[PDB]
Amino acid sequence: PVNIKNFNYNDPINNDDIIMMEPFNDPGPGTYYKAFRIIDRIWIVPERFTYKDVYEYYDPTYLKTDAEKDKFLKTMIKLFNRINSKPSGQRLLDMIVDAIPYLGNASTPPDKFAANVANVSINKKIIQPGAEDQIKGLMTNLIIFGPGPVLSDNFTDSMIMNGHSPISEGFGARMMIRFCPSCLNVFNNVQENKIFSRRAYFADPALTLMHELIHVLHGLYGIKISNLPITPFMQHSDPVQAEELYTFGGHDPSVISPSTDMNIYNKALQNFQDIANRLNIVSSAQGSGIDISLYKQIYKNKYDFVEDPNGKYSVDKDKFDKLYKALMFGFTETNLAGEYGIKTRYSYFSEYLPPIKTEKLLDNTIYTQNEGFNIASKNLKTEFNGQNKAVNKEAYEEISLEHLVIYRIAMCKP
Amino acid sequence: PVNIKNFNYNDPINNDDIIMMEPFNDPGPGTYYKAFRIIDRIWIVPERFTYKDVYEYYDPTYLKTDAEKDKFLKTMIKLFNRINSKPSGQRLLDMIVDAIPYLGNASTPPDKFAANVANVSINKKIIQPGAEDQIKGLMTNLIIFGPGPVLSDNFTDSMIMNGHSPISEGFGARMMIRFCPSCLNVFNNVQENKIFSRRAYFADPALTLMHELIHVLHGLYGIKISNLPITPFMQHSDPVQAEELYTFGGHDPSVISPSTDMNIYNKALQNFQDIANRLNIVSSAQGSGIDISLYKQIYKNKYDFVEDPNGKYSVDKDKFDKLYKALMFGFTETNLAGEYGIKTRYSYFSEYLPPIKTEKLLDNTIYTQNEGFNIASKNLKTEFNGQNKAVNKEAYEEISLEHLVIYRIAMCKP
Numbered sequence: 067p068v069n070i071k072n073f074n075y076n077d078p079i080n081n082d083d084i085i086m087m088e089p090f091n092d093p094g095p096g097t098y099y100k101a102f103r104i105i106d107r108i109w110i111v112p113e114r115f116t117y118k119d120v121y122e123y124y125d126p127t128y129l130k131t132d133a134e135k136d137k138f139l140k141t142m143i144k145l146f147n148r149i150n151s152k153p154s155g156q157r158l159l160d161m162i163v164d165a166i167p168y169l170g171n172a173s174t175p176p177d178k179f180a181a182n183v184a185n186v187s188i189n190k191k192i193i194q195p196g197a198e199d200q201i202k203g204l205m206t207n208l209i210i211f212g213p214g215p216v217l218s219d220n221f222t223d224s225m226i227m228n229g230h231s232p233i234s235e236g237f238g239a240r241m242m243i244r245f246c247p248s249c250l251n252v253f254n255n256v257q258e259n260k261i262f263s264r265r266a267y268f269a270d271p272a273l274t275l276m277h278e279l280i281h282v283l284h285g286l287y288g289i290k291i292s293n294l295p296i297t298p299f300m301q302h303s304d305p306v307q308a309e310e311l312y313t314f315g316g317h318d319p320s321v322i323s324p325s326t327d328m329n330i331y332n333k334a335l336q337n338f339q340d341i342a343n344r345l346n347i348v349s350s351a352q353g354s355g356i357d358i359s360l361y362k363q364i365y366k367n368k369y370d371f372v373e374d375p376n377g378k379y380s381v382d383k384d385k386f387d388k389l390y391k392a393l394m395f396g397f398t399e400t401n402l403a404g405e406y407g408i409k410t411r412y413s414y415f416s417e418y419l420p421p422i423k424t425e426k427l428l429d430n431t432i433y434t435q436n437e438g439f440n441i442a443s444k445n446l447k448t449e450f451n452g453q454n455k456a457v458n459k460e461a462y463e464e465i466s467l468e469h470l471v472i473y474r475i476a477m478c479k480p
Numbered sequence: 481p482v483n484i485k486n487f488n489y490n491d492p493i494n495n496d497d498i499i500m501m502e503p504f505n506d507p508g509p510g511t512y513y514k515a516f517r518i519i520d521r522i523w524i525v526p527e528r529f530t531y532k533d534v535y536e537y538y539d540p541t542y543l544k545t546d547a548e549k550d551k552f553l554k555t556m557i558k559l560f561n562r563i564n565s566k567p568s569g570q571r572l573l574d575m576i577v578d579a580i581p582y583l584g585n586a587s588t589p590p591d592k593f594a595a596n597v598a599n600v601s602i603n604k605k606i607i608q609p610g611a612e613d614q615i616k617g618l619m620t621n622l623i624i625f626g627p628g629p630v631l632s633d634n635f636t637d638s639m640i641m642n643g644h645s646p647i648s649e650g651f652g653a654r655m656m657i658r659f660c661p662s663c664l665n666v667f668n669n670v671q672e673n674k675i676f677s678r679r680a681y682f683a684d685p686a687l688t689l690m691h692e693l694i695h696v697l698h699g700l701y702g703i704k705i706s707n708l709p710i711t712p713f714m715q716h717s718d719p720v721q722a723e724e725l726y727t728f729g730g731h732d733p734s735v736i737s738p739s740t741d742m743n744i745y746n747k748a749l750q751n752f753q754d755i756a757n758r759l760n761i762v763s764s765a766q767g768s769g770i771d772i773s774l775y776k777q778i779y780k781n782k783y784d785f786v787e788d789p790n791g792k793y794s795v796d797k798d799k800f801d802k803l804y805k806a807l808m809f810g811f812t813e814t815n816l817a818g819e820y821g822i823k824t825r826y827s828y829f830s831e832y833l834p835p836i837k838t839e840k841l842l843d844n845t846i847y848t849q850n851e852g853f854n855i856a857s858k859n860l861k862t863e864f865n866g867q868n869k870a871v872n873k874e875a876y877e878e879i880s881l882e883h884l885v886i887y888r889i890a891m892c893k894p
């Protein structure tokens with residue numbers, strides 16, 4: 067299991083695991099932020115991200131003081147510690163750490179490694195007293211920010227290139243998440259009065275995190291692949307994306323057809339073969355310092371390629387099949403919920419109610435690494451009572467209308 | 481199997497199976513229409529109903545001439561003949577004919593039958609030459625209109641009462657459909673090039689009809705029951721209604737929870753028990769002509785009640801279970817599609833593409849009772865090629881932008 071490092075927000079810059087970084091590529095002089103490497107290749111940036119019915123949670127004041135940055139940082143670490151408490155989440159974190167993006171993309175020459183590209187590298191600033199600060203490239207797998215203007219809208223992405231998309235073509239891409247750990251999704255369950263009624267529950271934010279991490283993993287493997295578009299009417303994407311459904315509950319035959327399964331399977335396979343074909347012709351790097359054979363070995367390990375006695379890489383069908391299934395159907399939100407004794411929504415189509423806030427995720431009488439909210443010593447384990455809005459009221463507070471912007475779905479002229 | 485009668489639009493009023501009827505209850509003097517009883521308790525009224533992305537089909541000119549009324553009428557009959565060609569659709573039609581609404585509703589005294597209520601009776605006008613025309617009550621199960629302003633929007637309903645809703649409380653209610661037989665839904669299938677691509681298909685309008693008929697049946701049994709509302713935010717209905725999903729494909733465990741299944745089961749059972757309790761105390765009718773024991777027998781047969789040696793009705797659990805399952809899980813769009821060799825959408829969540837028009841449903845070289853579009857002698861049976869937009873082009877025509885209003889889904893202030 068991966069090591070997870072503790073930090074205080076005010077711990078000094080050391081240019082190693084506490085740094086100034088510029089993660090959005092450059093207007094030349096861009097904005098640098100204080101970042102914390104809690105796990106290899108995984109950084110927390112405790113700052114706001116600035117670069118039927120629906121509830122947007124606003125809070126302009128979230129993450130403005132150093133005290134609150136520190137709380138965000140500590141909460142993120144606690145959540146990773148939680149994920150790290152059980153073998154499945156441990157495996158999730160090991161696989162992310164290992165899933166280094168390919169040194170290149172569709173526009174890099176196939177016979178080269180190129181680290182100096184936006185899907186691979188950000189700017190890091192080496193802070194030295196007495197001399198001018200140097201700007202150095204830095205490779206990462208995952209950067210976690212705080213939220214943009216809307217807190218209730220956790221979201222994972224890349225910066226995608228001119229034309230092509232590395233996260234869907236096997237190259238993969240360094241991943242960024244916007245996250246609010248203290249903002250809890252709320253859902254329903256129709257439940258038998260130990261008469262039937264709707265019982266309201268709130269998310270365990272570690273499972274919320276694990277969900278985005280699944281996406282991260284798919285993106286890093288370059289297999290975040292879209293369903294065919296719906297193209298003639300005006301071209302547009304399928305409302306029901308198979309990778310989204312996979313991330314929630316693996317196969318979903320009643321919603322995703324076996325043909326759609328197969329199409330995505332075949333495109334992931336072709337993506338891996340493309341990477342193997344590239345590896346067989348890479349003979350140098352665009353810049354200096356890149357040791358080719360070392361990175362060939364890393365990618366062989368990441369994509370689980372076979373290597374013949376001449377050094378040629380190929381995709382083995384059994385090895386691909388086992389790795390694909392792990393990535394698409396092994397790590398799902400509902401598998402992990404079950405492993406962790408966490409209640410989640412019944413289905414991908416269940417609606418969210420208005421979100422709620424907790425200030426108590428660092429309080430071990432309320433939320434623990436090993437049990438989350440569902441603490442057996444308080445009788446909150448049974449029926450996931452610790453996530454039950456009617457039972458575990460001390461865990462959370464409702465969000466006022468001063469924070470909450472409400473919309474209704476309408477049909478309008480395009 | 482039910483008899484289905486042939487008619488011409490211009491066949492004269494005979495006050496029996498060709499009548500003037502006023503199906504929306506009264507501004508006093510309301511509007512009367514020429515209606516055709518093709519099956520017992522089932523009437524065709526060939527007139528317009530006046531009382532991600534989205535495509536509304538307008539055609540103000542549809543159903544204005546007598547020639548086109550006649551075509552609508554003949555097409556409706558052909559579609560019922562199609563449904564009537566196989567044992568499952570035969571059973572569907574027999575069950576509708578037999579599922580007379582209860583003579584009353586929540587506001588009628590439990591100890592009476594009341595035929596003169598809006599869920600039961602419409603006005604019929606007896607046309608006699610020489611004398612003033614008499615207005616008489618008329619009980620029906622199903623009235624099929626032409627479309628309202630939007631053709632692309634087939635829809636089934638009642639006129640629901642002040643307060644209560646008979647279609648969800650066991651009483652049931654006479655049902656009305658707005659239907660456009662010649663307006664075809666279009667859907668996709670991701671398909672293996674006998675490379676993967678999206679193949680466009682069009683609906684068989686008989687399966688489209690069968691779908692609404694399922695709803696009709698549920699409504700007539702008083703078991704068109706809503707999921708619990710989502711109530712505190714502002715109260716509203718569940719986007720994913722279990723009866724809608726049942727109508728499409730029966731159980732759907734990945735979407736509908738076993739608790740939601742059970743809640744709806746229990747409420748249907750209670751609805752039947754309420755009807756049985758009423759039957760045990762009905763001793764007269766509000767008006768004249770209603771023979772109580774005859775209608776008690778009809779309802780015993782409809783709801784499959786047991787009768788004890790004292791004349792008391794009760795609900796038998798095995799009999800309810802078998803009837804419930806038939807109504808909710810036996811008659812589904814996907815069961816019937818399979819029985820009829822009709823292609824439909826892969827799931828309830830699949831999106832519709834812009835609709836298309838056929839003028840050829842009365843042409844037996846293109847659409848038949850026994851095979852629909854999928855005619856083996858033209859090699860249109862294999863892979864449902866007769867519903868394939870790319871293969872069976874002669875079957876249909878695309879709808880112009882002069883007819884087609886386009887909307888996009890937006891999030892707006894409520």
Ligand SMILES: [Zn+2]
Nearest residue numbers: 277281310313
């Ligand atoms: Zn997701």
Ligand SMILES: [Zn+2]
Nearest residue numbers: 691695724727
């Ligand atoms: Zn329906």
